[PDB]
Curated annotation (Swiss-Prot), chain A:
GO terms for cellular component: cytosol; extracellular region; Golgi apparatus; HFE-transferrin receptor complex; late endosome membrane; lysosomal membrane; MHC class I peptide loading complex; MHC class I protein complex. The gene is B2M. One of its GO terms (biological process) is cellular response to iron ion. Residues 5-93 form the Ig-like C1-type domain. The chain holds residues 21 to 119 of 119 of the full protein. This is Beta-2-microglobulin. Its main location: secreted. GO terms for molecular function: MHC class II protein complex binding; peptide antigen binding; protein homodimerization activity; structural molecule activity.
Amino acid sequence: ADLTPKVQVYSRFPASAGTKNVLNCFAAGFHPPKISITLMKDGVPMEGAQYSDMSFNDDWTFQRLVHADFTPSSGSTYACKVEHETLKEPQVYKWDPEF
Amino acid sequence: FGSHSLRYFLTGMTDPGPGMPRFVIVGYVDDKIFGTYNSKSRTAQPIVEMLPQEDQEHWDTQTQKAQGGERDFDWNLNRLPERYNKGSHTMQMMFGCDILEDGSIRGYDQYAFDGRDFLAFDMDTMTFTAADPVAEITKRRWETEGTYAERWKHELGTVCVQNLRRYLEHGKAALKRRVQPEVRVWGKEADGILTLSCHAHGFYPRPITISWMKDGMVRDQETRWGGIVPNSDGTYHASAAIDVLPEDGDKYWCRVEHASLPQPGLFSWEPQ
């Protein structure tokens, strides 16, 4: 209820090194709706990201999905970086690769 | 008990962000986006993976209705901040209907300003309810007109239900198709604690359950649930984690219940 974004990062399919996949970042629970959500590989923005049309939950708080096609590499670090006016600094969320 | 729902989620924004539309509508049938509108394209269009054979006539109508809503919201964002003696602003509406197996219907119509409840309409009694004394001005003006209540009764109890029935028929294949979760269990040890994570990838419909168990007994006190979150293709993701002793890793089981599975699935951590 603080109106900061709550964020999680997950792959579309169970991940395997070198197998094409999609990386998702879902931010929810925030207000106002303006938000920067950026998928990052080793500190570099991922190309080809797509964002969902602005929508909201039954409690009126806003949410957005960002996703990008990617081929996960062991020894790369993937993250979702979020900027929002409730946040003093950008917040980052690491993807747990599950391999 | 069977039922279906049609919901429209309308957002107008004074500050949507660079290159983002100021007004957006997302429409859902059950747990599925069926269509959208935004103020950049100025077009209402179906999600073809749900509604693959739509006629343009219907969507011309939806487009014009949505353009009207866009105009209505533009005026709200101008007028309401002043009334509240109040930076950026938003207007939201959630409306729609349900049809139930028992033959009945329900209607919903709720508004919010700056992310706070503003106004609601009750189809059955044809009355409005305001969230605060400023909103009460709108409530009283609308009700004294007589027309808003008649028009919304029609919109929810006739138009919405006709469209819901239409999308259920047109979208039958996508709505009834079940997609199984691909479940993975992973383990990671850090500082003497093994965290077990169960992720269910790409399931449809939305309802799912995930439980962690040891020696047959659920460990709900120790479980952290990630929540059910969307994929871009209309399917969903969910997760649960639990922290365990490394030596106990092999005796925990993740149970997943989903409509696509004939029985609850059971999954364990199997490190090499």
